[PDB]
Amino acid sequence: TITVPTPIKQIFSDDAFAETIKDNLKKKSVTDAVTQNELNSIDQIIANNSDIKSVQGIQYLPNVTKLFLNGNKLTDIKPLANLKNLGWLFLDENKVKDLSSLKDLKKLKSLSLEHNGISDINGLVHLPQLESLYLGNNKITDITVLSRLTKLDTLSLEDNQISDIVPLAGLTKLQNLYLSKNHISDLRALAGLKNLDVLELFSQECLNKPINHQSNLVVPNTVKNTDGSLVTPEIISDDGDYEKPNVKWHLNEVSFIFYQPVTIGKAKARFHGRVTQPLK
């Protein structure tokens, strides 16, 4: 308990973050004393691009509802665990993977974790109230848990490693869905998302299981539009030909590009990507 006015420097162990608090409080120096009343009156911390390595001390700001921590060096958010009034949290371009620290933040409506090198998102199961979630540019593979998040109207999973989008099937409140740059080759389970305004599906990279190099190679086309029909290949490598439903080559790896427009609800998307077939 700050029972006497205490220098900002002594409360917040990280110099970068102490500097941020000095400026948000409009103070002159990080050596300047602050009362708890002052800390209690901060609703908002704007702390982008400030090289913060630790928000240790943020516990003493119990009433903060918005936190902008984009573009810092955080690798741990345990101090946020008790900021129960938190509504918006943005943690882009840090290296944060302990999402369980967020488990009891029940008022949290918007959350951004883009560019954090995240692979396990199972922690998000504890945040069913989320209205807005950004996970672009991570290493995400399994999005099973997102089936719970039926209050989301905005979801961004772009630039990840997702191939199965079936867990999105019931998220019918979604209006904006970003899935470009993944391993998605089957759109069928997105057909019920009829409240979509915006959908992006471009630049998918798909990689088949390896098979034996032959003179007469025949790989079956597995790319499906929302209605379940095959997307016709547009460019085939190594002078290959389409013989519906198979791509066929007369020949140590081959590929094709696909493209097809896609409507769901009121959203028009460009389903586009590459299927690569490694050989041995």
| Rounded Cα distance, 106 and 70, in Å | 21
Instruction: Work out the widest C-alpha separation in the chain, in whole angstroms.
Output: 82
Range of the domain at 277: 210-280
Six token digits for residue 10: 């002594």
Residues 59 and 92 placed together within one structural domain of the fold: yes
| Rounded Cα distance, 132 and 54, in Å | 25
Residue 52, CA distances (Å) to 69, 74, 115, 212 in order: 8, 6, 16, 51
The CB-side HSE value for 231 (13 A sphere, CA atoms) comes to: 27
Question: Which of 183, 209, 235 marks a domain boundary?
Answer: 209
Question: Which of 174, 209, 244 marks a domain boundary?
Answer: 209
Q: Give the pairing type, strands 233-236 and 253-264.
A: antiparallel
Q: What share of the chain is helix, strand, coil (3-state, %, to 5)?
A: 15, 30, 55
Tell me the sheet residues that pair with 155.
133, 177
Question: Which of 150, 185, 209 marks a domain boundary?
Answer: 209
The CATH number given to whatever domain includes residue 105 is 3.80.10.10
Determine contact, residues 256/240, Cβ cutoff 8 Å: yes
| Rounded Cα distance, 268 and 265, in Å | 8
Domain total in the chain = 2
Annotate 222-244 with DSSP letters as a single string. --B-TTSPBPPEEEESTT-EEET
Three-state DSSP class for 2? coil
Six token digits for residue 39: 């800390």
Determine contact, residues 269/199, Cβ cutoff 8 Å: yes
∠ at Cα 116 (21, 83), nearest 5°? 40
Closest CA to 111 of 56, 61, 156: 156
Three-state DSSP class for 131? coil
**Phi-psi domain of 239 (left: phi exceeds 0; alpha: psi -120 through 50; beta: other):** left
**Resolution in Å, one decimal place:** 2.8
Three-state DSSP class for 274? strand
